[PDB]
Tab-separated table of C-alpha atoms and ligand atoms in Angstrom:
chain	number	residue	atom	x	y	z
A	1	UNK	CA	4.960	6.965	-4.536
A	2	UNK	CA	8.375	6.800	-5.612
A	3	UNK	CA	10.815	7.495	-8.835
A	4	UNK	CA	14.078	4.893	-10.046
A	5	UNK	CA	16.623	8.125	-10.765
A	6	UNK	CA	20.110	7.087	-11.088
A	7	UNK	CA	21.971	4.178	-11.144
A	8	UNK	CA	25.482	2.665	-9.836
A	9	UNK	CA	27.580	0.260	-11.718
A	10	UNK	CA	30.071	-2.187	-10.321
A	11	UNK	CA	30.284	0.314	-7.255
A	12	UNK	CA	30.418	3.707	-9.214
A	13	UNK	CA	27.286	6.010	-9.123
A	14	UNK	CA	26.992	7.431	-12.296
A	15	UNK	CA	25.323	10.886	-10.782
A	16	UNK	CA	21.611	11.913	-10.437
A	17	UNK	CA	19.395	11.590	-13.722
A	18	UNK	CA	22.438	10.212	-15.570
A	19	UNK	CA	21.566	7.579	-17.937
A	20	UNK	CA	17.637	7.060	-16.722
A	21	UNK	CA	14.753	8.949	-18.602
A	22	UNK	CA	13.700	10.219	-15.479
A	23	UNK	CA	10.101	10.801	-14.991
A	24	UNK	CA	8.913	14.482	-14.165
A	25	UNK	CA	7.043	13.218	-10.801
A	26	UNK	CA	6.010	10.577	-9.029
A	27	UNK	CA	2.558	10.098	-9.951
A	28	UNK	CA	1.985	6.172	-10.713
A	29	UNK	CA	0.836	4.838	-13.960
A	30	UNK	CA	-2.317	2.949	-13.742
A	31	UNK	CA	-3.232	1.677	-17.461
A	32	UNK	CA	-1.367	-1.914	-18.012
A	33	UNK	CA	-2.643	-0.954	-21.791
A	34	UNK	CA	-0.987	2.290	-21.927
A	35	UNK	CA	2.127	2.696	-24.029
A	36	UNK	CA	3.356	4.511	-20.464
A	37	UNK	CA	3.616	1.106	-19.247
A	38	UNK	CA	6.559	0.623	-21.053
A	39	UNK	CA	9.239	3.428	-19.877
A	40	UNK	CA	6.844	5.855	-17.990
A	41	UNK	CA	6.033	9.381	-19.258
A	42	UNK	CA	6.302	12.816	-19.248
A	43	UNK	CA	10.156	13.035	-19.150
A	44	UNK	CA	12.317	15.941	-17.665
A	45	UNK	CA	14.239	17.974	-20.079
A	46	UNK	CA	16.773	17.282	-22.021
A	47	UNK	CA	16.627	13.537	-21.676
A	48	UNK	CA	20.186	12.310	-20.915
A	49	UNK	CA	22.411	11.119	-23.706
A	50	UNK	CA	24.659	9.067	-21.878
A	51	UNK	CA	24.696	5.467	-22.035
A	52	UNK	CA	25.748	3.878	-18.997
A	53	UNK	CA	29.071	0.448	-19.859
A	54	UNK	CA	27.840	-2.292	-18.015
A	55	UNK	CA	29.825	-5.360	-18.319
A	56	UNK	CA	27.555	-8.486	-18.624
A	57	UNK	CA	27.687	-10.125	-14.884
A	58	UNK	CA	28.260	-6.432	-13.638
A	59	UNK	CA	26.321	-5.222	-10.482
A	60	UNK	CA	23.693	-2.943	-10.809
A	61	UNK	CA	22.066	-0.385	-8.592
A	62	UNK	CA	18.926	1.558	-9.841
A	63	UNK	CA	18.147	4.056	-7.282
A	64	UNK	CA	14.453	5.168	-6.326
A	65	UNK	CA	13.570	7.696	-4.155
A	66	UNK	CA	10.076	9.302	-3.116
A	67	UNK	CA	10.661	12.177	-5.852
A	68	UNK	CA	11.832	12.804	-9.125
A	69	UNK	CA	14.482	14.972	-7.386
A	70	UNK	CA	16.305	11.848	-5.757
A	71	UNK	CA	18.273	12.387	-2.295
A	72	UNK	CA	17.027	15.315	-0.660
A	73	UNK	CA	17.570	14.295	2.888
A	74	UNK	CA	14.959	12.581	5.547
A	75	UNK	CA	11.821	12.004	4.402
A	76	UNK	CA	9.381	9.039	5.684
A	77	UNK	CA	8.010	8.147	2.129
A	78	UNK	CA	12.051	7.832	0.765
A	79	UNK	CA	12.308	5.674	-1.153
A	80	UNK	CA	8.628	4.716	-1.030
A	81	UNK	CA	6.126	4.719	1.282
A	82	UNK	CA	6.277	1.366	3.399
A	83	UNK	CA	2.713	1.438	3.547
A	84	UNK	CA	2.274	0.389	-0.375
A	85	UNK	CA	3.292	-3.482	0.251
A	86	UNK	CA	4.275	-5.419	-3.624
A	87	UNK	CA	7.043	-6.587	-5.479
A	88	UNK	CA	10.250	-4.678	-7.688
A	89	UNK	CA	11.353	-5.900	-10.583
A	90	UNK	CA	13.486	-5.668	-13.475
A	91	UNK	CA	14.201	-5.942	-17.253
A	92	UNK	CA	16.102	-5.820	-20.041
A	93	UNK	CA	15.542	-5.296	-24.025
A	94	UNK	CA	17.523	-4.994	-26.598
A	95	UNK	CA	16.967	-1.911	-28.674
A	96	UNK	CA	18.927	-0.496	-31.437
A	97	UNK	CA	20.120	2.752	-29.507
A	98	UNK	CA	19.816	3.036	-25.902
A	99	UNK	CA	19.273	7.119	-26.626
A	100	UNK	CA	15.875	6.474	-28.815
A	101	UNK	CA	12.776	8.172	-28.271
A	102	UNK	CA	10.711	5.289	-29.420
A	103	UNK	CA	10.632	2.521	-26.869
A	104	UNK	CA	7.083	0.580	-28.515
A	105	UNK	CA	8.056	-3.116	-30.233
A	106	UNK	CA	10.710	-4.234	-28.136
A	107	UNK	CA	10.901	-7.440	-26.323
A	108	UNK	CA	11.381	-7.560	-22.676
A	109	UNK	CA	12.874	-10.219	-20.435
A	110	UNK	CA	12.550	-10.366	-16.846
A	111	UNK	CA	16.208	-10.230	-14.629
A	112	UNK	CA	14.839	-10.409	-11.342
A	113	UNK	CA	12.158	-9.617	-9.089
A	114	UNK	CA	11.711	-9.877	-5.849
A	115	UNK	CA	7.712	-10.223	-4.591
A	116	UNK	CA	6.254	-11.461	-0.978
A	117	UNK	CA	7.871	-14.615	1.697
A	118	UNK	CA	5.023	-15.847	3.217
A	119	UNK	CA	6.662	-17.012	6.491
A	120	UNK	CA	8.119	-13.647	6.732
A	121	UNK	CA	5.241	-11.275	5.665
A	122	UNK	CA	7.943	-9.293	3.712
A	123	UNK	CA	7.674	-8.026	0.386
A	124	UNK	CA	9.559	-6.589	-2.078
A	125	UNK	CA	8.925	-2.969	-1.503
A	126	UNK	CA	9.942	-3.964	2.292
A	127	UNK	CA	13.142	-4.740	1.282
A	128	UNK	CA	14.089	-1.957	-1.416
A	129	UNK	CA	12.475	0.546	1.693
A	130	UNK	CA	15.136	-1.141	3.992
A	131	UNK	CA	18.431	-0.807	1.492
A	132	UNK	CA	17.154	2.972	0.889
A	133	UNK	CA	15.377	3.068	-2.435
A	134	UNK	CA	18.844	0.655	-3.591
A	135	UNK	CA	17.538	-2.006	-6.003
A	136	UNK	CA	20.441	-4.456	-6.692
A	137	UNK	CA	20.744	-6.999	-9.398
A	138	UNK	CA	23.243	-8.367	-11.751
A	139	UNK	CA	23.065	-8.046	-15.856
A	140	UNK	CA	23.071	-11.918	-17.103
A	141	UNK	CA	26.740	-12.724	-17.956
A	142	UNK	CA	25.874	-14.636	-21.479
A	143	UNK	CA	23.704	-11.883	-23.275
A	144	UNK	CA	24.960	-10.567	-26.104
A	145	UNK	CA	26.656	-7.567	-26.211
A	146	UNK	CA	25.224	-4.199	-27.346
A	147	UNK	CA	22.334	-1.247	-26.567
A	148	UNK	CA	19.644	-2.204	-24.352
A	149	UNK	CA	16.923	-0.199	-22.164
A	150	UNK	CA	16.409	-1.679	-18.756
A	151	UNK	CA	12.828	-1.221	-16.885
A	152	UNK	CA	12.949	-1.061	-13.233
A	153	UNK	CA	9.331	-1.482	-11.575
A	154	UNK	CA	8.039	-0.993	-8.552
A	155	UNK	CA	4.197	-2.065	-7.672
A	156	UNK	CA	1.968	-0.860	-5.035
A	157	UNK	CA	-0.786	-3.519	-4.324
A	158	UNK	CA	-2.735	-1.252	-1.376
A	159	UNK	CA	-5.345	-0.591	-4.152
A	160	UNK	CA	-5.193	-3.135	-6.105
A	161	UNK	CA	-8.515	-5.113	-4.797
A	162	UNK	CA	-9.943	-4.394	-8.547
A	163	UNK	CA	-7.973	-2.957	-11.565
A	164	UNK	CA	-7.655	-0.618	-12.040
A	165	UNK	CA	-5.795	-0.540	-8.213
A	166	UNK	CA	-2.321	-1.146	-8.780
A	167	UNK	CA	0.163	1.407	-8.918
A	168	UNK	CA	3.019	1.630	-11.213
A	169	UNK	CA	6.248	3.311	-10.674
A	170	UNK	CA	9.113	2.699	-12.831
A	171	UNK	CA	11.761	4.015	-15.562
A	172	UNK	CA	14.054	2.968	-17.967
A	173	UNK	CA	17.679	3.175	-17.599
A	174	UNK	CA	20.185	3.068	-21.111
A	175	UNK	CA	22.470	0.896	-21.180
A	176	UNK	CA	25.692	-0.639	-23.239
A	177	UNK	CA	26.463	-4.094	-22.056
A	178	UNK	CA	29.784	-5.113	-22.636
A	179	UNK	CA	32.215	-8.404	-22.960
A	180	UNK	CA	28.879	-11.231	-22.671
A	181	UNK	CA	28.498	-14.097	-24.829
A	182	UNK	CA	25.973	-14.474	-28.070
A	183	UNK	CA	22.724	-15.488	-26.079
A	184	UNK	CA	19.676	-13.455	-27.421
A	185	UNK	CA	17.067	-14.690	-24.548
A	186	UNK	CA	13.115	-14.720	-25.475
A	187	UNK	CA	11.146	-11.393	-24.487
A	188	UNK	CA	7.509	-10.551	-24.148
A	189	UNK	CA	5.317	-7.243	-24.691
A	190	UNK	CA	4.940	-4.072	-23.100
A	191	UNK	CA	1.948	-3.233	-23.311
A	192	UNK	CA	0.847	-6.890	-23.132
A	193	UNK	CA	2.937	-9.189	-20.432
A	194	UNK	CA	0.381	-7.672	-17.569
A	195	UNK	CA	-3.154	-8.133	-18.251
A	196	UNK	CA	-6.154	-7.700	-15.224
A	197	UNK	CA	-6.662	-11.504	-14.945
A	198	UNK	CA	-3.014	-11.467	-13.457
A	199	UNK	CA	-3.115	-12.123	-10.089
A	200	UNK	CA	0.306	-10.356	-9.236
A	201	UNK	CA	-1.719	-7.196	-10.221
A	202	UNK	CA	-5.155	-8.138	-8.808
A	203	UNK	CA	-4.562	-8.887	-5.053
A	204	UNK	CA	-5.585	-7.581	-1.365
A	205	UNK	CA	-2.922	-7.582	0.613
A	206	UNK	CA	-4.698	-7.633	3.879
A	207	UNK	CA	-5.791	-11.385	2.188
A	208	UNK	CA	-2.667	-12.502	0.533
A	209	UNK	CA	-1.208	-16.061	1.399
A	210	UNK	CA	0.734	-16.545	-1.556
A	211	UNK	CA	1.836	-14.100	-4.409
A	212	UNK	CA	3.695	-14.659	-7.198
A	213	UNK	CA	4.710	-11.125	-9.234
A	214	UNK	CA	2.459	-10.463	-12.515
A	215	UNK	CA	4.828	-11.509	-16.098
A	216	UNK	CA	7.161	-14.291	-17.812
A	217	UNK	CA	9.570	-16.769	-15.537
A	218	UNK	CA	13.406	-15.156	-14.564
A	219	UNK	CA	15.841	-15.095	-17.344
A	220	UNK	CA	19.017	-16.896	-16.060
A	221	UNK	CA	21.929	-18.548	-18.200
B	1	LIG	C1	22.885	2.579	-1.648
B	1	LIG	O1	23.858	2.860	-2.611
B	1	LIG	C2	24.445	4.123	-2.395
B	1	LIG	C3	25.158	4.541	-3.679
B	1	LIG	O2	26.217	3.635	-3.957
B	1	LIG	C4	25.337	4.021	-1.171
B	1	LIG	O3	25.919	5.297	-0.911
B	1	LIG	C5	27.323	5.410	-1.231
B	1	LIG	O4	28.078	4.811	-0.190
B	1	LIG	C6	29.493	4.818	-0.390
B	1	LIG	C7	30.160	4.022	0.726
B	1	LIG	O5	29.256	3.871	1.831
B	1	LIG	C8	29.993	6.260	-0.432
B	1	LIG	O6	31.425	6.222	-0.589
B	1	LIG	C9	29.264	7.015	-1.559
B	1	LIG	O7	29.557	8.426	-1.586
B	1	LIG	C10	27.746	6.873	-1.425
B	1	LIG	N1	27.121	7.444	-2.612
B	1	LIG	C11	26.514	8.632	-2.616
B	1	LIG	C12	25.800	9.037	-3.877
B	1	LIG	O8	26.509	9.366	-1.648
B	1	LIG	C13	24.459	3.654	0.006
B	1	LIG	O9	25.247	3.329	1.167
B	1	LIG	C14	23.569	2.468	-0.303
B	1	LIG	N2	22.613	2.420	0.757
B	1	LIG	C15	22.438	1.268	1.364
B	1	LIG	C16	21.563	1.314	2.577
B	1	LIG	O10	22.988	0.249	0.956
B	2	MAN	C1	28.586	-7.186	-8.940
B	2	MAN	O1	28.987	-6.939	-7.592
B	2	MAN	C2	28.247	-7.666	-6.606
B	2	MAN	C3	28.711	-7.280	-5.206
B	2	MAN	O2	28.032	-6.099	-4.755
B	2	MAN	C4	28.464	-9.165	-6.797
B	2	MAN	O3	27.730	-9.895	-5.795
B	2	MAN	C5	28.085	-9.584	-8.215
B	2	MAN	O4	28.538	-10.915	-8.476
B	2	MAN	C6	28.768	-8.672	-9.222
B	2	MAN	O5	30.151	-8.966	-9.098
């Protein structure tokens, strides 16, 4: 189980629960058809109001950690237990204001992800275990500038023989990219990118030879 809490930009951290609408545990969701797949659920109070500048081609951290709580020293399952082998990944969609409670309708594009190297038996969830819960990525340089919500995901695969199996963890951080260019890239649903024919969501990973993570291509300029 783990929780994406916080967030650094361009090498400043921002401070715990700033700018994410941090989930009150660390329970996964399990329903691809649920309107929690979309930004999680169950939010802790108040929801933060800031909005986090994020120049377009800026560096990105979003931080998980086992809990909701974020660093609260050595723990085996921080930032997730290594056990639950599958991929992270990340979007962005533009919404009218980063701060609204309404997150349904919006359109999604994928940023990077990062799922399983054959050759190396690693996964995602290896790596982001390795660099302490620290996802890394960089915001597209061309989008256009403005308020966007940005889903961080990570997926545990150890039950995911049948669906429902896989295990859900994510949030979504508000953002205000800034500088960019006019490119308005192509999005798809949440709910209805991941369905249970996907085989990024339907896979035993004690029999997994290839994997390619479940949803649309990269986005890249
Ligand atoms: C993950 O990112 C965090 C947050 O940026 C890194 O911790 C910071 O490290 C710098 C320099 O090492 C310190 O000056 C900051 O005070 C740290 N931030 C906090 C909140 O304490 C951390 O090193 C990264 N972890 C890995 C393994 O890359
Ligand atoms: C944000 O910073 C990272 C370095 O951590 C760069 O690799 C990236 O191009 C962006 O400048």
């Amino acid at each position: 189980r783990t929780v994406f809490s916080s967030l650094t930009v361009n090498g400043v951290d921002l401070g715990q629960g700033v700018a994410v609408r941090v989930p009150s545990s660390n329970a996964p969701v399990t329903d691809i058809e649920s309107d929690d797949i979309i930004c999680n659920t169950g939010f802790i109070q108040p929801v933060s109001k800031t909005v986090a500048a994020v120049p377009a081609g800026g560096t990105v951290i979003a931080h998980f950690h086992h809990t909701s709580a974020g660093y609260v020293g050595p723990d085996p399952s921080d930032p997730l237990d290594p056990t639950n082998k599958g991929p992270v990944l990340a979007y962005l969609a533009k919404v009218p204001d980063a701060t609204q409670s309404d997150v349904t309708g919006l359109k999604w594009f994928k940023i990077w992800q990062d799922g399983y190297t054959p050759a190396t038996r690693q996964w995602g969830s290896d790596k982001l275990f390795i660099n302490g819960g620290n996802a890394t990525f960089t915001i597209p340089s061309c989008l256009q500038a403005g308020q966007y919500l940005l889903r961080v995901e990570s997926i545990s695969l150890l039950n995911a023989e049948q669906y429902p199996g896989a295990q859900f963890f994510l949030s979504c951080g508000q953002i205000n990219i800034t500088g960019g260019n006019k490119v308005q890239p192509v999005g798809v649903d949440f709910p209805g990118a991941y369905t249970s024919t996907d085989p990024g969501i339907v896979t035993d990973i004690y029999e997994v030879g290839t994997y390619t993570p479940p949803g649309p291509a990269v986005f890249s300029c």
